[PDB]
Enzyme design. Structure first.
Site, PDB file in Angstrom:
ATOM      1  N   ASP A 196       6.030   2.051  -3.624  1.00 13.87           N
ATOM      2  CA  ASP A 196       6.360   2.320  -1.957  1.00 13.87           C
ATOM      3  C   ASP A 196       5.542   3.695  -2.126  1.00 13.87           C
ATOM      4  OD1 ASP A 196       8.042   0.862  -2.454  1.00 13.87           O
ATOM      5  OD2 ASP A 196       9.303   1.581  -1.300  1.00 13.87           O
ATOM      6  N   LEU A 242       1.496  -7.936  -4.174  1.00 11.21           N
ATOM      7  CA  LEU A 242       3.005  -8.470  -3.872  1.00 11.21           C
ATOM      8  C   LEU A 242       3.358  -8.314  -5.397  1.00 11.21           C
ATOM      9  CD1 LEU A 242       5.507 -10.933  -2.610  1.00 11.21           C
ATOM     10  CD2 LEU A 242       4.325 -12.495  -4.023  1.00 11.21           C
ATOM     11  N   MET A 243       4.802  -7.417  -5.198  1.00  6.90           N
ATOM     12  CA  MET A 243       5.686  -7.602  -7.032  1.00  6.90           C
ATOM     13  C   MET A 243       6.668  -8.183  -7.061  1.00  6.90           C
ATOM     14  SD  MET A 243       3.676  -6.174  -8.143  1.00  6.90           S
ATOM     15  CE  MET A 243       4.130  -6.115  -9.890  1.00  6.90           C
TER      16      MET A 243
END
Ligand SMILES: CCOC(=O)C1CCN(c2cc(C)c3c(OC)cc(OC)cc3n2)CC1
Length: 255
Positions: free
Chosen positions: A158, A93-94
């Site tokens: 991504d 998680l960013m």
């Protein structure tokens, strides 16, 4: 939790964190490391087809990746969420957003920040390319480069998304140098604080210029020559003529 990984290692909560047109991102949890994580669900409207296999092996290799400048990949599988057959990925998680969002906010990047962050992108790409087999991003762009924090580092995201599918390298109408072209355009955005080829109205006007190897107006607004020199060596029309990542990292500007 309203859902779980097949491994049981991960838990989905009912708390949306983002809504791309084609995907949704929930807050989720690694039961193993008790670190909060991202639970990405993207409709298989792509009908990946029996190329599902290709992703499996892609996705398996992506779990094998660990680097300071690659957002970590944990797991993926196929579920039917909503009425729609889809695909769930699980990734580090960013929280502090993208380069894209950062640019707007600050509206000008300090040349010291740009050096350090761009170098880090190169370092990330270098990792990806030196894998066996080499990994090409094929889709490097400012909104899928993530920062740790406003004072922190970058990590390319991504990764998986790249498989299941706008400015892209001219020749491409893949290979290592496609990413060099991408990076070039990233560094131009990061330098000019604005989106490459903004002048153009329709997509075709962009395609026109890219094909005929006309540079974006942005290019001229580049103040520092040493940057411009670099961006130049990146967005060169001929595959052969562009610099490698090694060439860029061994550059004076970088390290
Ligand atoms: C306050 C705004 O911030 C957010 O909510 C962020 C939304 C985007 N995030 C993602 C999403 C996807 C699909 C990723 C991905 O897909 C393959 C790969 C990836 O590296 C392997 C990282 C990824 N990181 C994290 C949270």
């Amino acid at each position: 939790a309203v859902a779980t990984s097949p491994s049981g290692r991960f838990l989905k909560f009912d708390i949306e964190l983002g809504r791309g047109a084609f995907k949704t991102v929930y807050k989720g949890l690694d039961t193993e490391t008790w670190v909060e994580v991202a639970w990405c669900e993207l409709q298989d409207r792509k009908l990946t087809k029996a190329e599902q296999q290709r992703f499996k092996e892609e996705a398996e290799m992506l779990k094998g990746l660990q680097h300071p400048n690659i957002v970590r990949f944990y797991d993926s599988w196929e579920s039917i969420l909503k009425g729609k057959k889809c695909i769930v990925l699980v990734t580090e998680l960013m929280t502090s957003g993208t380069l894209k969002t950062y640019l707007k906010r600050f509206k000008v990047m300090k040349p010291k920040v740009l050096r350090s962050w761009c170098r880090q992108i190169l370092k990330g790409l270098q990792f990806l390319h030196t894998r066996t087999p080499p990994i090409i991003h094929r889709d490097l762009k400012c909104d899928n480069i993530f920062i740790t924090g406003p004072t922190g580092s970058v990590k390319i995201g991504d990764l998986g998304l790249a498989t299941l599918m706008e400015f892209m390298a001219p020749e491409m109408y893949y290979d290592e140098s496609v990413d060099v072209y991408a990076f070039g355009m990233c560094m131009l955005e990061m330098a000019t604080s604005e989106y490459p080829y903004s002048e153009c109205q329709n997509a075709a006007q962009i395609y026109r210029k890219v094909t005929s190897g006309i540079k974006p107006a942005s290019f001229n607004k580049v103040t520092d020559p040493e940057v411009k020199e670099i961006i130049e060596g990146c967005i060169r029309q001929n595959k052969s003529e562009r610099l490698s990542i090694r060439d860029l990292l061994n550059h004076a500007f970088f390290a």
